[PDB]
Design a protein around this ligand. Structure first.
Ligand SMILES: Cc1nc2ccc(C(=O)NCc3ccccc3)cc2n2c(-c3ccccc3)nnc12
Ligand SMILES: [Mg+2]
Ligand SMILES: [Zn+2]
Length: 340
């Protein structure tokens, strides 16, 4: 209760008081210490005027925010700080790219809340592993796909249906249903499999030009912005990309270890013996990350800097790829590592 007490009664700090650069793309939200992140969630909500506009109950909101935070486990990458930094990028798009000209207020509110909840209760493993290991989640959800993402959605709903946690309690039936509909759509788009299916449609949308009167264009745009948030670590400095590669490949390799204890051949990228991290990083950037921010740039001309930094961070990887080949002796002055 003490964290809840202080988060509820101390008041909401202004976004500038968190960091002077808080509303800028150049700022890295991972540098904020975890114990401050719940306050920063409230301050962003305050600053986007969602608390006032939707008359969100503050006691309810405090509990909800902490419940979402304590709904994340602690694998190398898919932990609370990922959700937080993903939500922050959603805040950055609101401040810097004028989402109100494209999207309804409620759709913008949904995206931000979806960002907070999109990876709840993740276990450092992807959808394929759920079927392979025959986990509880596959048993539930494998027949429509997007296993983890459906679980992510279900967990967020469980948080809403916990007593005193339903930040939308006072919404009309029609607003409540719209908000949960949005959360379904938005969270399921976090499966990169989904993104790859809607990619042609996203290109179509960019070519012809955005149409605020077109209901499909809203749905498509909402998906693109979610993925943009989900991969937003790539739009920062080189250093952030470096660290995030380290965290995800730790997570991934751990899965591989389990897969081959269960007698399966992991996919190259899960395999610590086979995975060449430089080619995999560049490949993810080229085929997945870069074209997303290209499309984001195509729809928002003010999002050019984001594509530019991802493109530059890709160049940075190619330049450092040679450090993965050992020259001379490895500073041990030993070649004991070869006895196998
Ligand atoms: C840095 C990085 N590399 C990834 C490499 C590889 C992958 C990854 O899952 N690739 C395989 C894949 C691609 C397309 C569709 C289905 C499966 C993800 C990476 N990633 C993410 C991420 C992970 C899971 C879900 C959503 C996003 N976020 N950052 C990364
Ligand atoms: Mg996910
Ligand atoms: Zn994610």
């Amino acid at each position: 209760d003490d964290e809840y007490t202080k988060l509820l009664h101390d008041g909401i700090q202004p976004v500038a008081a968190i960091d002077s650069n808080f509303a800028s793309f150049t700022y890295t939200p991972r540098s904020l210490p975890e114990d401050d992140t719940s306050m920063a969630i409230l301050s962003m909500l305050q600053d986007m005027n969602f608390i006032n506009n939707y008359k969100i109950d503050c006691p309810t909101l405090a509990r909800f925010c902490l419940m979402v935070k304590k709904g994340y486990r602690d694998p190398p990458y898919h932990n609370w700080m990922h959700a937080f930094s993903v939500s922050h990028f959603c805040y950055l798009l609101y401040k810097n790219l004028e989402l109100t000209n494209y999207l309804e207020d409620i759709e913008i509110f949904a995206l931000f809340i979806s960002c907070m909840c999109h990876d709840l209760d993740h276990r450092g493993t992807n959808n394929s592993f759920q079927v392979a290991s025959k986990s509880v989640l596959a048993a539930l959800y494998s027949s429509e796909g997007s296993v983890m993402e459906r679980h992510h959605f279900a967990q967020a709903i469980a948080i809403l249906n916990t007593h005193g946690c339903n930040i939308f309690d006072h919404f009309s039936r029609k607003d409540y249903q719209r908000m949960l509909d949005l959360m379904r759509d938005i969270i399921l788009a976090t499966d990169l499999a989904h993104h790859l299916r809607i990619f042609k449609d996203l290109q179509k949308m960019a070519e012809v030009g955005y149409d605020r009167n077109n209901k499909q264009h809203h749905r498509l745009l909402l998906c693109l912005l979610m993925t943009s948030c989900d991969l937003s670590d790539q739009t920062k400095g080189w250093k952030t990309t470096r660290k995030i590669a380290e965290l995800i490949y730790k997570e991934f390799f751990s899965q591989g270890d389990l897969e081959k204890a269960m007698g399966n051949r992991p996919m190259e990228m899960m395999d610590r013996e086979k995975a060449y991290i430089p080619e995999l990083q560049i490949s993810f950037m080229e085929h997945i990350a870069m074209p997303i921010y290209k499309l984001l740039q195509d729809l928002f001309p003010k999002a050019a800097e984001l594509y530019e930094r991802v493109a530059s961070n890709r160049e940075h990887w190619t330049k450092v790829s040679h450090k993965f080949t050992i020259r001379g002796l490895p500073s041990n002055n030993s070649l004991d590592f070869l006895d196998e």
